[PDB]
């Protein structure tokens, strides 16, 4: 409740994000010419549905683990009760990764960083969920048009996580208070940097929810086809969040 306090929250959030961002932006940018060839692409398409699902679930889990660490270092998160921490992470971890993903997306040729190189949505054809894949690509394309700075991603992803509307919260008002302070920090930073134009261009929450629902739906379809693969070869954290 003072400029100095809000500004302190902005830097805290930005720091917490930097420490848990998984890959540095520069590293991702340096690799943009490193693109899968036609032969490697064909190689991905020839892989079994279940091998590809397993690999995607593994990489999603790695990314989620960084988001979990982000939350632990996020001012006020650990002071919430354990029930609410779990509720917020279960609902928001995937949404945060989806936002973070625009950093690894190349709008100029419509590719994303995956297993050491950049590839287009055709790389994922073996998954058998083309609607989900192109929606994530489209979502990433829309976020790329905003030209997020890292600090903006830090602040926005903090708010994606700290959402007082999540069902199952026991200390709703306490999450409301933290949410409000992070909104002030985000919006103060946007005001300071003359970037409040992006507020109206941020995707609605229903878009993020739609992507997460589709992901869960397509997992369910896949798990019905290969139940022992999920039981035997999917990461436990993934199954906990999504099964």
């Amino acid at each position: 409740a003072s400029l100095t306090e809000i500004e302190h929250l902005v830097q805290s959030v930005c720091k917490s994000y930097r420490e848990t961002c998984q890959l540095r932006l520069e590293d991702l940018l340096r690799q943009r010419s490193n693109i899968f060839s036609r032969e490697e692409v064909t190689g991905y398409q020839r892989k079994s549905m279940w091998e590809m699902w397993e690999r995607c679930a593994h990489h999603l889990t790695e990314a989620i683990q960084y988001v979990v660490e982000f939350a632990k270092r996020l001012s006020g998160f650990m002071e919430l009760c354990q029930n609410d921490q779990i509720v917020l992470l279960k609902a928001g971890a995937m949404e945060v990764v989806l936002v973070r993903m625009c950093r690894a997306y190349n709008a100029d040729n419509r590719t994303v960083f995956f297993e050491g190189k950049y590839g287009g949505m055709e790389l994922f054809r073996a998954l058998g969920c083309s609607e989900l894949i192109s929606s994530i690509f489209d979502f990433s394309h829309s976020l790329s048009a905003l030209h997020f700075s890292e600090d903006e991603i830090a602040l926005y992803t903090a708010l994606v996580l700290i959402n007082a509307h999540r069902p199952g919260l026991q200390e709703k008002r306490k999450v409301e208070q933290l949410q409000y302070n992070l909104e002030l920090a985000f919006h103060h930073h946007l005001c300071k940097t003359h970037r409040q134009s992006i507020l109206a261009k941020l995707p609605p929450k229903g878009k993020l929810r739609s992507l997460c629902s589709q992901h869960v739906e397509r997992l369910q379809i896949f798990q019905h086809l290969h139940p022992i693969v999920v039981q035997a070869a999917f990461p436990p954290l993934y199954k906990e969040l999504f099964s």
């Binding site: 683990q65 632990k72 650990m78 354990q82 779990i86 992470l89 436990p236 954290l237 906990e240 969040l241």
Partner: peptide
């Protein structure tokens, strides 16, 4: 279970 472990 896993999420609980990561947080603690």
């Amino acid at each position: 279970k896993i999420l609980h472990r990561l947080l603690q």
